[PDB]
Each structure stands twice: as structure tokens, then as C-alpha cells.
Amino acid sequence: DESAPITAEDSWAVISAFFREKGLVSQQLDSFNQFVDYTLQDIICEDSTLILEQLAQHTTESDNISRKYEISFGKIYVT
Amino acid sequence: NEFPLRAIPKEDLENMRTHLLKFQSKKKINPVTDFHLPVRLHRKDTRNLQFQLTRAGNLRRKTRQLKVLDENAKKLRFEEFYPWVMEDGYNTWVGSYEAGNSDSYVLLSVEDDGSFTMIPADKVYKFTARNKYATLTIDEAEKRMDKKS
Amino acid sequence: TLSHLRRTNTPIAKPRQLHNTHWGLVCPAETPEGQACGLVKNLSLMSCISVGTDPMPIITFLSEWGMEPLEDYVPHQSPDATRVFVNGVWHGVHRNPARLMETLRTLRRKGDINPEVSMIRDIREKELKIFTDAGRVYRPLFIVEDDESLGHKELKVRKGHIAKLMATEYQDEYTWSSLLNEGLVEYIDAEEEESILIAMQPEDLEPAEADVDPAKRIRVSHHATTFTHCEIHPSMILGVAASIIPFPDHNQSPRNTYQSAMGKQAMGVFLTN
Amino acid sequence: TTFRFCRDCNNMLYPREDKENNRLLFECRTCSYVEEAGSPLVYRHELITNIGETAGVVQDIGSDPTLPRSDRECPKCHSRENVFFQSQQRRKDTSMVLFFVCLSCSHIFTSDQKNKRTQ
Amino acid sequence: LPHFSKDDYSPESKGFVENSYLRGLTPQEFFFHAMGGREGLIDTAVKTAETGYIQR
Amino acid sequence: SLQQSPWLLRLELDRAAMNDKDLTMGQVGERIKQTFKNDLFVIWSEDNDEKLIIRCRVVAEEDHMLKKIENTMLENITLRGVENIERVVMMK
Amino acid sequence: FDMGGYFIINGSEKVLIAQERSAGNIVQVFKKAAPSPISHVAEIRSALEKGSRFISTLQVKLYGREGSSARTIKATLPYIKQDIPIVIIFRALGIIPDGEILEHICYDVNDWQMLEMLKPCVEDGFVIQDRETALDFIGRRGTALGIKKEKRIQYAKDILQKEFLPHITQLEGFESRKAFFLGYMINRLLLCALDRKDQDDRDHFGKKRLDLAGPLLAQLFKTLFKKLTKDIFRYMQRTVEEAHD
Amino acid sequence: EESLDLDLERSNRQVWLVRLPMFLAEKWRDRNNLHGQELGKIRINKDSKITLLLNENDNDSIPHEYDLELTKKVVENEYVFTEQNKKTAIVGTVCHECQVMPS
Ligand SMILES: [Zn+2]
Ligand SMILES: [Zn+2]
């Protein structure tokens, strides 16, 4: 009879399990965790890399030298 | 409870001296090859070169006084539009490459021996009447070079 | 402390009123008196808020399951086409939504599609909107299926699962997640709530009629044969503060609203440390 | 009403009177296209509308659990299985007349005991 | 509420609390009484400052 | 029995509505006739006749002209009553 | 018994309060009150899930009131002073002939009622006949104006790509997608004006979002990281000038 | 012969081809083909059901049948043109479009 319909008192056994797992502030914690594990990385990667280019006067040495420097942001760590 | 079945062997040749591409026409332009007799398909190099302005102690300049130079941008030969001229007086179409992820529809072709051979679609081009197209302005040309690369 | 970690602020049509859509998501009694009245919402016990998932596994799934892309739509050719949206982005159309909707629902109830993802099918409007979106308030409900060899439409959860849980209750292997992946229970946000039909009590609102106590309150019926879901427990519509009110069903509406404000100022042991 | 477009342009058609043969035409204001009119009716206003009442009646109408059922015998197949709703024309005035959709023949019958319909 | 069928103009659907306080309210009765109850708290709250300024 | 535009403005009136706000086809028609004077030719179906109709014609380019005439007709033509005075209830 | 969910800043416990906002990327139709030229508006608060977050709200306005002649449909585009008649927008998008435009708005060829309601718009956009002339008309109406023919047509391109319907895509070749959407919006605008649908409930909880501790920190960290990013750049200039390592 | 001329032979003898969307995982297995380059069988069963099944050697795996979802190529006209290692030619007109569904 393990496939018998559930009574009204049985709904509490489910509610017990909901709280055993989630607790009373699952919203507060689940939000923060999502931000630390994922959101944080994506914020570091949207604009991320920034470049500065130094293009010369093309007169003669020491001119005629065009350069571009990069600065990149990879994985994010959190102690 | 009865089915008629036809089964065909499929080969995917690593050997191949050809690249298979798609030539697509819009239903509104009503293209009918029957009227075709001779056709010329050639690349469009009108926009071979393109010069784009590029930004070049003292304090950094305000935006209104930033200094610039120029850079020559080379269009990938494979990133040039196709130009289709049908029947000498007649129809003319411009084919623009479809922008897409690195995935490609396979073309299944029947061989004389009866089996199918499948090949990856190299490029997909949308062709439309040249009258819908206008001489590319510097702005559009620059915008195009970027899309492609 | 508890009720402070479930508090909601609304800055700046008729916001202060208790909306029907607030059912099971926000406490009908726990709100301040004066200036902030009805602009400071308090979450019901079983309410959770969508963390925000990725839309691509669903967009990739859709196209593969009969979804014609908008880029190739021809309105008069397929004129009855159900328009499909994923986060207010119209992705294309589908010819047999009936079967697609069932596939997507089975995908969620299995776990393949995340349970916090909201998917609604407005038949009359010919629309299927999907939300992977962050910030949506949801509540868990029991699933009811016409699906029962023996008889009528019956709640998936059976007395066997109940003992299977109380076995784990005595251990302190069958969690809440276990009910969720076994597709016995589901998460329903307010937009999705629009398309469902809920029973309050399971047992009292399931088998039809084939003396009566006068002291008990006057109750309605299980006339519906359409029931898609059942209420875990109606008392769960209440927030932390209102949940200490004894017999709140026997008090005048605001007297309850008052207690869920005073108990916050009642002395006692706040923490053992 | 139900209006046409220009074949060639696909652009809409504007009515022109052929003063000589006293007849109505439809001209294209983008090309030189002209076609004679199908009906003499060019414009219909319609203030007291009835179009909206039985909207969104997809054959899947039965799959909405939110819809209520009744044991009313169908005028066609005589089936006591049907879903019902009120005039979907979201106006203030609107009567509380009910539209029943058969869970077999799909025929739309009403509860209107003042008037007789076909929609 | 989602516990009702569409186009339900019945007393039970549109907020008629059939029961006494002594008997107790059904969840539906409870929530509707709560909506109606909230309305009064809103005017009590607002009226308070509107009424004050009129006096001034 | 007991010159004009080939374009016709035909409007159907509601018998039920024509009664609650007591009105005759004659009196309705008279207002239109007296509004547009001798620059609009009006005819009307009798109060007895099944459908309630008013046929109107003017006295190159006429399509837009009539669409203005129908707007004037619906929005500006006052049949009975005083302006600003709507919903009048009788009370004992 | 302590349940967590707070921070510890300088020794006092702090709780982020969930903030309630209206969900974005959502089509909503509202009747604009008795004294107004515009009778109904279709609004979409378009914003990105992440990345800059362009809070550009597109309004699709039904000019003229219930009983006014020439009821036109114009739409206020981000960075454009005037409201452009829907038709010109579709033309600037690439959907050039009427009826091809109408197909994107009205989905039933039978529905004469909605279609008659589109005739004024077609008349309004009759002046502009190709994609180019449509972009110029959009480009003319600034901005500021930004005088020069090549400049204004090049500017219209950018607005439609970057500021018009930024969800969906901000990419290039997606005119088809943004056209069908605009058409879905006009469909909803007219559906409400034809009294077939109800005005959107601004108070439906399903249309509201709650910004919790996660997104709140994300909002702050964005503006705080772009604050750091552009302070490093200010340094890379200072240190490339004097080669100061 | 004359450069620029699109050899319209393929379209003149009206050769038809199929355009099929293939899951990336399946085309990756095809890549491991050897011998004569065979990868499997295309089956068309009528009473119409079209499907593709990998052969025993290529799959190295339990047998599966990839169903095809037939689609219309109506809204437009598609043709195939090839460019050899330099001649251009319209080898065929897409007579059928289909999607090979993962399975
Ligand atoms: Zn024309
Ligand atoms: Zn029937």
C-alpha cells in the first residue's frame, strides 16, 4: 500500500523536508552564492581588458614606431 | 502494418577538390533559373582597401582635441560579396555572406552508384537584386570589415 | 531577526493593496501601519526567489523540438503558430505547442530543465513565455495527475513517499530534492500560477460523493476534474510573524496585522550566545 | 471590408473613380497599377462590435484547466462535454452571455435566450 | 484565485465570508478578508496626514 | 416619389438604443439635415422598416471629405439634451 | 540557532533588504488618460541581463483619441527627439512594401478591423519609400541634428543597432527579429484599443522582480570595477609617458 | 571555360540535393570514417519516416536511429554552387530541407 493517497497530516512531513533542506533564509544565501560563484567572474570579463596605443610621428628614428599595450583579466579567486 | 522501405549508404568523403556553398534567393524576388542561359559569378573587390581613422609629458587631451592617424584595413578575400550577372542587359544580384556560428548544414548529394555523399556547407550567401543595393559608403564599408573580422 | 531577513522594500498604480497575485508569495497580514503600509512586503514561509539561470540550453532545446526561427517566419503560411518567448525575446514559433509544452514540463520535472525556470502556455493568446530570469518569487506545490490507472486524477505523492521521508526524519537519504527530481512537487511563480488550477486540501478535495458536523466552518467542493496542482498547506501563505498567531482564522483581519508588528517588540531569548 | 494590395509593388491600394464608365477602381500610388473593385463598400466603421466574443478558440481550448465545464447537450453532436467562457470583447457594456465549446464537435453554442447566433 | 475556475461570479469566488469568527475562515475567506482589511489600514495611514494639513 | 455625389455614407442605427433614449428616425434624420443644410442629401428608413438606415450624399477628390463628415456626424451632432449633462436618473 | 544571511561590517550585523522593481524586457499596454493627444501606449523597458544596462524604454504611441480622425502610430526611439511613424522604422529596418510591413503587425488577413486601423500609418509613411531615405529621415531628427547627409544616414544605422530594442540583440544583421517584435508590439497596442485585451495590470506580482543580496552587490561591483578599470588606464598613460616601469 | 561563367550543368539537368542540419556530435563521428568513407544508412519508410543510423564500425556504440524532421524550403529558393581547387558551377537545387534530430 506504498502507493496509497496522502492524508492532510502528511503535508507536514513534506513541509518538514522543505525546511530541513532550504532553511529560513534560503533566498538570502542562494542569492549571494550565485553572485560569488558565477556573477563575480562575468563582471570581471564584460569590459575586462583595456588597451593603450602609442603611434609615432613617423619622422625618423627615434620616430616611426607604433605600439599597442594590453592588460587582461583572467580567472577570479576569493579566499 | 506494411511499409515500403528505401535505404541508401551514406559516405562522408575526406577527399574533395570542391567547396560546397549555398546560394539563397528571396521568394519576393521570384528567381527562376529556366530563364537563365548564361551566368557570370565573380567576386566584388570594389572595397578592396579601406582607410579608417585610428587614435594616436603632457596631460591626456580632452576628447575634442584627441589626435588621430590612419590604418589600412585588408578585407579577407573570402569576405567579399559575390556578384551574379545573369544573361549578359538582364538581372544582376549581390550575394552577402550569412553571419553565423561555426556550424554548417551538410549537403547530401546522390552518386551514380546510388549512395549518398554528404559535404559540409562552406559558406551560405543571400542573393538579392542589385537594385536593392547601393554604392557602399565609407561608414558601411568600415562597418562591414568589422562584422566579418 | 527572522522576519527582518524576509523583508521587502518597494520605493515610490495602487501598490499598498494586497493583490491576488500575492497569494502564497507574500504575507497578507505582516505589513506596517502608516506611511510604509503595503509598501513593505514580507515573504511567506515557502517563498523563494529565482537566482537566475542560462537561457541557451533552453533556446538550443527549443529549436531542436520543432521551433521555427523568427528569421524565416511567414505569418499567413503558419497563421495559428504559437509564438515562443524566452525572457521577452521572441525566438520563433511552434506548430504543435501541446506536445512541446509536455516535453518542456517533463524536462523540468526530471531536472534536465532547472526547476526555478518558469514556463507558461496561454492557449487563448497562442503564446509560450519562458523565464530563466532572476528575481521571480516562487512557491512549491504538489503535482496532481489525471494519470492513475486506478480511478481519477490523483496527487503524485503517495503514503509510501511520506514514510520514505519520515524514515530520514528519524535518522536525525530522501530529501526535498528527492521529491523535486521525482517530479512529485514543482516551483510555480506568479506568471505561471495564471495557467494552473489548485486544490486546497488533497484528501478533502479529490474523490467525489457516491450527518455533517455543525461546529466546523462551511467549506466548498472538489467540483474540478481539471486540477493540475494541490496546496502543500494553506497556512504557508503566512510569513514568519503571522505564523505565531494562534487561530488567525478566528480574528478580525487587522488584529492579525497588529500582532505581526508587536511580536517583533516582544522580549525573550534572541540567541543562546 | 477586406482590402487588396498591388501585385508588382505589394503596396496598398487607394480607390479611384472611373468618371467615364461610372465604376470604382483601386490604384497603386507607387506604380501604374489599377484594378476594378470587388465590392462597392470601401470603409466600414462598426461602433457596436461583436468581433472579439469568440476569440482564441484554438482546438487545444479543452487543454486549459482554468476553464470551467458543463453538462449542456450540444446542438450538433448532443455531447454533454464542453468548456465555457464569457464575451472576450473586453468592454464595460458587454453582456454575461456564455459561449460553450464542444469537447468533440468543437461547435460554439451560447446561453443567449434573447437572440440566436452562428459564431 | 488559482483555486477557482475562470468567469466565477459566485459569492465564494468574489469574497463572501459565509462563516462567523467563532467558526473560523477558509483559506480563500481568510485571504479575501485580508485584502479588504488592508484597504482600511491604507486609508487610516493616508487620511492621517491629509486630515492634518486640512486642519492647519 | 410622394446632380449629387456617387459616394454614399450609410449608417445603421440600433432600435433598442433608439428607444431607451426615446427617438424617431425622422427626428434623428432631421438633426443631420438641419446640421449640414443644403450641402448634404439625406434619406432614411422608416421606424417600422426592419433595419434602421440613413443614406447621405454630398452636393474630383471626395473619399477623405466623407470621412470628415462621418466624424462631424458622430462627435458633433447633438440630437436631444443639454451639453455636459449625461446619465439622468429619475428619483422619488 | 543563528541562521546567517547578514554581513559583518565594522562589527555590526547588516541585512541587505530585497528591493522590488518592475521586470524589464516586458511589453505593456496602457490607456493614456482623457486629456491626452495619445490614447494608448505600448511600453517596453528594455535592459541587458548584464553589460552596461541601457535603460532605454521604447514607447509605441497611438496618436488621436477614441473619436478623432487620423489615428496614426508613432514611436519614440532612444537618442531621437521626435516619435517616428512606425512605417518609416520598418522601412529603415528593411521591410519596404506595405503589406510586407502589415504582415509583421496583423497576423490574420481576415481581420479587416485592425487592418483599417493601419491605413493611416501607411499614409503617414508614404513619403519615405526606400531603406536609405528612411534612415536619413531618422538621422535628420537628432541627436542635436549632426548636419551632413553621409553623417545622418550613418547615425540612424547605429541607433537601430545599439539603442533600439537592445535585448534580442545589439548585433548587426537582426532587422528581421526586431521588425517582427515591433509588429508584435503594434499588434498588442491595437488589440487593447480594439477592446479585445485588457490594459496591463501594473500591479501583477508576476511582472515584479526582487533584487536581493546577489544582484545588489552585482550592481555595486559593476560601477566599482569600472571605477578601478578606468583608474588603471589613467595610470598606464602616466607610466608610458615617463617609461617609469 | 571562360572564367566567371557559372557552369549551369547541375541545374540544367535539374539535379536535386538535400540540405540537412546535423548535430555537431554526429558529424564528429563521421570524421572518424575510413575505408570507402562510409558512415551509415539513410532510411526512408513509407505507408513518411526518414532517419539516419550510424554503421557498426563508426558508432562503436549501441545502435540509434536519428529521425529527420522534414521542413519546407518554401520561403525562398536555395541552390548549391561549388568552387574547385578554380571552376564555379551550380551542381544542384535544394529539393528538400530537413533537420537530423539528436537521439
Ligand atoms: Zn504598385
Ligand atoms: Zn458537439
Tab-separated table of all heavy atoms in Angstrom, chain C residues 185-221:
chain	number	residue	atom	x	y	z
C	185	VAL	N	6.558	17.318	-6.745
C	185	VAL	CA	6.400	18.707	-6.355
C	185	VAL	C	7.137	19.616	-7.370
C	185	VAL	O	8.097	19.171	-8.016
C	185	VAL	CB	6.875	18.854	-4.899
C	185	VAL	CG1	8.398	18.827	-4.777
C	185	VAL	CG2	6.278	20.082	-4.242
C	186	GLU	N	6.652	20.863	-7.536
C	186	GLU	CA	7.158	21.816	-8.533
C	186	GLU	C	7.200	23.259	-8.022
C	186	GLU	O	6.415	23.628	-7.143
C	186	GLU	CB	6.206	21.776	-9.738
C	186	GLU	CG	6.848	21.549	-11.091
C	186	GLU	CD	5.879	21.618	-12.258
C	186	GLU	OE1	4.645	21.685	-12.030
C	186	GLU	OE2	6.362	21.615	-13.412
C	187	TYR	N	8.062	24.095	-8.636
C	187	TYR	CA	8.144	25.518	-8.305
C	187	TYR	C	7.340	26.362	-9.322
C	187	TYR	O	7.614	26.316	-10.534
C	187	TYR	CB	9.600	26.002	-8.227
C	187	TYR	CG	10.444	25.409	-7.120
C	187	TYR	CD1	11.783	25.103	-7.332
C	187	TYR	CD2	9.943	25.268	-5.825
C	187	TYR	CE1	12.587	24.602	-6.304
C	187	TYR	CE2	10.731	24.746	-4.796
C	187	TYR	CZ	12.056	24.412	-5.042
C	187	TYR	OH	12.864	23.887	-4.062
C	188	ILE	N	6.351	27.146	-8.806
C	188	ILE	CA	5.431	27.990	-9.582
C	188	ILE	C	5.461	29.471	-9.176
C	188	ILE	O	5.004	29.841	-8.084
C	188	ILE	CB	3.990	27.390	-9.547
C	188	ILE	CG1	3.926	26.043	-10.266
C	188	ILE	CG2	2.939	28.343	-10.111
C	188	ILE	CD1	3.846	24.905	-9.356
C	189	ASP	N	5.954	30.321	-10.100
C	189	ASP	CA	5.967	31.772	-9.908
C	189	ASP	C	4.573	32.323	-10.245
C	189	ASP	O	3.731	31.587	-10.775
C	189	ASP	CB	7.090	32.461	-10.729
C	189	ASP	CG	6.865	32.610	-12.232
C	189	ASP	OD1	6.269	31.696	-12.835
C	189	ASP	OD2	7.334	33.624	-12.807
C	190	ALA	N	4.330	33.611	-9.939
C	190	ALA	CA	3.040	34.257	-10.178
C	190	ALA	C	2.538	34.211	-11.635
C	190	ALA	O	1.341	33.993	-11.840
C	190	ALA	CB	3.066	35.680	-9.663
C	191	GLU	N	3.437	34.377	-12.640
C	191	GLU	CA	3.045	34.342	-14.052
C	191	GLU	C	2.520	32.976	-14.441
C	191	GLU	O	1.493	32.889	-15.118
C	191	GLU	CB	4.186	34.778	-14.974
C	191	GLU	CG	3.709	35.691	-16.094
C	191	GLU	CD	3.742	37.178	-15.778
C	191	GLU	OE1	4.860	37.707	-15.572
C	191	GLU	OE2	2.672	37.832	-15.790
C	192	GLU	N	3.195	31.907	-13.960
C	192	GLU	CA	2.828	30.506	-14.205
C	192	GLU	C	1.545	30.128	-13.492
C	192	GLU	O	0.766	29.335	-14.029
C	192	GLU	CB	3.965	29.555	-13.806
C	192	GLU	CG	3.955	28.232	-14.561
C	192	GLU	CD	5.202	27.375	-14.433
C	192	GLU	OE1	6.298	27.943	-14.224
C	192	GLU	OE2	5.086	26.136	-14.575
C	193	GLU	N	1.324	30.701	-12.284
C	193	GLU	CA	0.144	30.480	-11.444
C	193	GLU	C	-1.144	30.760	-12.241
C	193	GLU	O	-2.172	30.105	-12.044
C	193	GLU	CB	0.231	31.379	-10.188
C	193	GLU	CG	-0.580	30.902	-8.991
C	193	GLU	CD	0.085	31.173	-7.654
C	193	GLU	OE1	1.113	30.521	-7.359
C	193	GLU	OE2	-0.403	32.057	-6.913
C	194	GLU	N	-1.051	31.690	-13.186
C	194	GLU	CA	-2.155	32.106	-14.023
C	194	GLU	C	-2.812	30.983	-14.803
C	194	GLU	O	-4.025	31.030	-15.018
C	194	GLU	CB	-1.692	33.216	-14.973
C	194	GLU	CG	-1.803	34.604	-14.379
C	194	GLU	CD	-3.198	35.206	-14.320
C	194	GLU	OE1	-4.203	34.448	-14.312
C	194	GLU	OE2	-3.274	36.455	-14.281
C	195	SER	N	-2.014	29.983	-15.223
C	195	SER	CA	-2.436	28.848	-16.056
C	195	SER	C	-2.707	27.519	-15.325
C	195	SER	O	-3.096	26.538	-15.967
C	195	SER	CB	-1.415	28.631	-17.168
C	195	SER	OG	-0.132	28.389	-16.617
C	196	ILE	N	-2.522	27.480	-14.002
C	196	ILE	CA	-2.748	26.268	-13.215
C	196	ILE	C	-4.129	26.288	-12.501
C	196	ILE	O	-4.879	27.268	-12.607
C	196	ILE	CB	-1.541	26.003	-12.273
C	196	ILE	CG1	-1.551	26.956	-11.050
C	196	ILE	CG2	-0.214	26.073	-13.049
C	196	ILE	CD1	-0.407	26.803	-10.079
C	197	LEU	N	-4.473	25.192	-11.811
C	197	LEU	CA	-5.711	25.071	-11.043
C	197	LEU	C	-5.426	24.226	-9.800
C	197	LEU	O	-5.227	23.005	-9.912
C	197	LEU	CB	-6.855	24.505	-11.894
C	197	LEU	CG	-8.164	24.195	-11.174
C	197	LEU	CD1	-8.850	25.459	-10.666
C	197	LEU	CD2	-9.074	23.423	-12.068
C	198	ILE	N	-5.389	24.893	-8.617
C	198	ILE	CA	-5.007	24.328	-7.318
C	198	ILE	C	-6.140	23.896	-6.378
C	198	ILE	O	-7.132	24.612	-6.217
C	198	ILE	CB	-4.015	25.293	-6.606
C	198	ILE	CG1	-2.932	25.810	-7.565
C	198	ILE	CG2	-3.385	24.651	-5.374
C	198	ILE	CD1	-2.363	27.086	-7.176
C	199	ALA	N	-5.948	22.733	-5.715
C	199	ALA	CA	-6.845	22.220	-4.680
C	199	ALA	C	-6.230	22.609	-3.336
C	199	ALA	O	-5.009	22.564	-3.195
C	199	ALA	CB	-6.958	20.716	-4.784
C	200	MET	N	-7.050	23.023	-2.370
C	200	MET	CA	-6.565	23.468	-1.054
C	200	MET	C	-6.084	22.324	-0.172
C	200	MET	O	-4.991	22.380	0.405
C	200	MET	CB	-7.652	24.258	-0.325
C	200	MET	CG	-7.104	25.379	0.501
C	200	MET	SD	-6.808	26.852	-0.502
C	200	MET	CE	-5.123	26.828	-0.546
C	201	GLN	N	-6.941	21.319	-0.037
C	201	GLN	CA	-6.720	20.112	0.743
C	201	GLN	C	-6.554	19.006	-0.279
C	201	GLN	O	-7.128	19.119	-1.365
C	201	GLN	CB	-7.945	19.815	1.627
C	201	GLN	CG	-8.338	20.943	2.594
C	201	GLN	CD	-9.830	21.236	2.648
C	201	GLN	OE1	-10.561	21.152	1.643
C	201	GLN	NE2	-10.300	21.662	3.815
C	202	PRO	N	-5.780	17.941	-0.007
C	202	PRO	CA	-5.671	16.882	-1.011
C	202	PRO	C	-6.894	15.976	-0.896
C	202	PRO	O	-7.804	16.045	-1.724
C	202	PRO	CB	-4.343	16.186	-0.658
C	202	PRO	CG	-3.923	16.728	0.683
C	202	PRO	CD	-5.022	17.596	1.208
C	203	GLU	N	-6.939	15.206	0.200
C	203	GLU	CA	-7.959	14.237	0.592
C	203	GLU	C	-9.392	14.773	0.517
C	203	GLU	O	-10.265	14.119	-0.063
C	203	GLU	CB	-7.640	13.669	1.993
C	203	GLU	CG	-6.972	14.657	2.940
C	203	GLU	CD	-7.457	14.559	4.368
C	203	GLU	OE1	-7.311	13.478	4.984
C	203	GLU	OE2	-7.990	15.571	4.873
C	204	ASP	N	-9.620	15.972	1.088
C	204	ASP	CA	-10.937	16.615	1.110
C	204	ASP	C	-11.351	17.088	-0.301
C	204	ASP	O	-12.550	17.121	-0.619
C	204	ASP	CB	-10.973	17.788	2.127
C	204	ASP	CG	-10.486	17.477	3.544
C	204	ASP	OD1	-11.286	16.933	4.345
C	204	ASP	OD2	-9.332	17.850	3.875
C	205	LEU	N	-10.354	17.431	-1.141
C	205	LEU	CA	-10.609	17.910	-2.491
C	205	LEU	C	-10.156	16.955	-3.624
C	205	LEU	O	-9.619	17.408	-4.632
C	205	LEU	CB	-10.160	19.392	-2.698
C	205	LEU	CG	-10.640	20.477	-1.698
C	205	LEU	CD1	-10.157	21.844	-2.118
C	205	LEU	CD2	-12.167	20.510	-1.552
C	206	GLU	N	-10.429	15.640	-3.483
C	206	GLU	CA	-10.089	14.668	-4.525
C	206	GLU	C	-11.189	13.666	-4.919
C	206	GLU	O	-11.652	13.766	-6.058
C	206	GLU	CB	-8.709	14.011	-4.334
C	206	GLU	CG	-7.523	14.912	-4.647
C	206	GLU	CD	-7.317	15.305	-6.095
C	206	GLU	OE1	-8.187	15.998	-6.668
C	206	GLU	OE2	-6.252	14.953	-6.646
C	207	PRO	N	-11.658	12.713	-4.063
C	207	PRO	CA	-12.715	11.783	-4.517
C	207	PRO	C	-14.131	12.340	-4.339
C	207	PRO	O	-14.474	12.838	-3.264
C	207	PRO	CB	-12.471	10.518	-3.676
C	207	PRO	CG	-11.418	10.910	-2.631
C	207	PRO	CD	-11.252	12.394	-2.681
C	208	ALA	N	-14.961	12.242	-5.397
C	208	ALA	CA	-16.346	12.737	-5.430
C	208	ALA	C	-17.317	11.966	-4.511
C	208	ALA	O	-16.966	10.894	-4.013
C	208	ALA	CB	-16.859	12.732	-6.861
C	209	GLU	N	-18.540	12.519	-4.298
C	209	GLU	CA	-19.605	11.925	-3.471
C	209	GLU	C	-20.335	10.788	-4.226
C	209	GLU	O	-20.712	10.961	-5.391
C	209	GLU	CB	-20.601	13.007	-2.998
C	209	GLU	CG	-21.390	12.638	-1.749
C	209	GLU	CD	-22.450	13.642	-1.329
C	209	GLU	OE1	-23.575	13.581	-1.873
C	209	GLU	OE2	-22.161	14.469	-0.436
C	210	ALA	N	-20.528	9.630	-3.549
C	210	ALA	CA	-21.186	8.439	-4.098
C	210	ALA	C	-22.608	8.269	-3.565
C	210	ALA	O	-23.429	7.593	-4.188
C	210	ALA	CB	-20.362	7.199	-3.787
C	211	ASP	N	-24.980	13.086	10.691
C	211	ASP	CA	-24.708	13.569	9.336
C	211	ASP	C	-23.422	14.454	9.285
C	211	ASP	O	-22.333	13.912	9.516
C	211	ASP	CB	-25.958	14.255	8.736
C	211	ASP	CG	-25.976	14.345	7.216
C	211	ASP	OD1	-26.165	13.294	6.562
C	211	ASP	OD2	-25.886	15.474	6.687
C	212	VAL	N	-23.540	15.787	8.988
C	212	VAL	CA	-22.407	16.730	8.914
C	212	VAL	C	-22.310	17.532	10.202
C	212	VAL	O	-23.331	18.034	10.686
C	212	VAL	CB	-22.429	17.684	7.682
C	212	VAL	CG1	-21.035	18.232	7.392
C	212	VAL	CG2	-23.000	17.006	6.440
C	213	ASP	N	-21.074	17.674	10.735
C	213	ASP	CA	-20.770	18.419	11.964
C	213	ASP	C	-21.119	19.906	11.826
C	213	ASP	O	-20.694	20.555	10.863
C	213	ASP	CB	-19.302	18.237	12.390
C	213	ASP	CG	-18.986	18.850	13.740
C	213	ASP	OD1	-18.771	20.074	13.798
C	213	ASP	OD2	-18.973	18.107	14.740
C	214	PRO	N	-21.889	20.459	12.789
C	214	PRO	CA	-22.285	21.869	12.682
C	214	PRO	C	-21.243	22.878	13.172
C	214	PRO	O	-21.222	24.016	12.696
C	214	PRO	CB	-23.585	21.937	13.502
C	214	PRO	CG	-23.778	20.560	14.117
C	214	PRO	CD	-22.490	19.829	13.978
C	215	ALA	N	-20.397	22.462	14.131
C	215	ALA	CA	-19.368	23.291	14.756
C	215	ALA	C	-18.221	23.709	13.812
C	215	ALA	O	-17.635	24.786	13.995
C	215	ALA	CB	-18.837	22.597	15.999
C	216	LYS	N	-17.928	22.870	12.793
C	216	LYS	CA	-16.890	23.100	11.776
C	216	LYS	C	-17.321	24.229	10.817
C	216	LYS	O	-18.526	24.421	10.611
C	216	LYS	CB	-16.604	21.796	10.987
C	216	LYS	CG	-15.857	20.726	11.792
C	216	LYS	CD	-15.911	19.322	11.179
C	216	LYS	CE	-15.483	18.267	12.177
C	216	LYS	NZ	-15.464	16.901	11.587
C	217	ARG	N	-16.349	24.969	10.230
C	217	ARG	CA	-16.639	26.041	9.265
C	217	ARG	C	-17.246	25.482	7.947
C	217	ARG	O	-16.981	24.327	7.583
C	217	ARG	CB	-15.386	26.901	8.986
C	217	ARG	CG	-14.335	26.258	8.070
C	217	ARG	CD	-12.934	26.740	8.354
C	217	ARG	NE	-12.528	26.398	9.715
C	217	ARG	CZ	-11.397	26.802	10.281
C	217	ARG	NH1	-10.539	27.548	9.599
C	217	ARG	NH2	-11.114	26.457	11.528
C	218	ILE	N	-18.060	26.297	7.246
C	218	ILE	CA	-18.684	25.921	5.975
C	218	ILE	C	-17.609	25.930	4.868
C	218	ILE	O	-16.975	26.961	4.630
C	218	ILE	CB	-19.920	26.817	5.677
C	218	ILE	CG1	-21.060	26.512	6.658
C	218	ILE	CG2	-20.404	26.655	4.246
C	218	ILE	CD1	-21.898	27.707	7.061
C	219	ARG	N	-17.381	24.757	4.238
C	219	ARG	CA	-16.394	24.534	3.174
C	219	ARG	C	-17.072	24.281	1.805
C	219	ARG	O	-18.222	23.825	1.756
C	219	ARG	CB	-15.467	23.361	3.554
C	219	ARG	CG	-14.100	23.799	4.075
C	219	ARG	CD	-13.640	23.039	5.312
C	219	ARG	NE	-12.375	23.587	5.821
C	219	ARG	CZ	-11.950	23.496	7.082
C	219	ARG	NH1	-12.687	22.875	7.996
C	219	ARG	NH2	-10.789	24.034	7.438
C	220	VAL	N	-16.354	24.588	0.691
C	220	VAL	CA	-16.829	24.386	-0.694
C	220	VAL	C	-16.579	22.932	-1.199
C	220	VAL	O	-16.672	22.006	-0.386
C	220	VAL	CB	-16.402	25.505	-1.696
C	220	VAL	CG1	-17.201	26.785	-1.472
C	220	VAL	CG2	-14.901	25.786	-1.639
C	221	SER	N	-16.282	22.711	-2.505
C	221	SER	CA	-16.079	21.351	-3.032
C	221	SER	C	-14.908	21.155	-4.041
C	221	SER	O	-14.213	22.111	-4.405
C	221	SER	CB	-17.387	20.805	-3.610
C	221	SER	OG	-18.387	20.621	-2.621
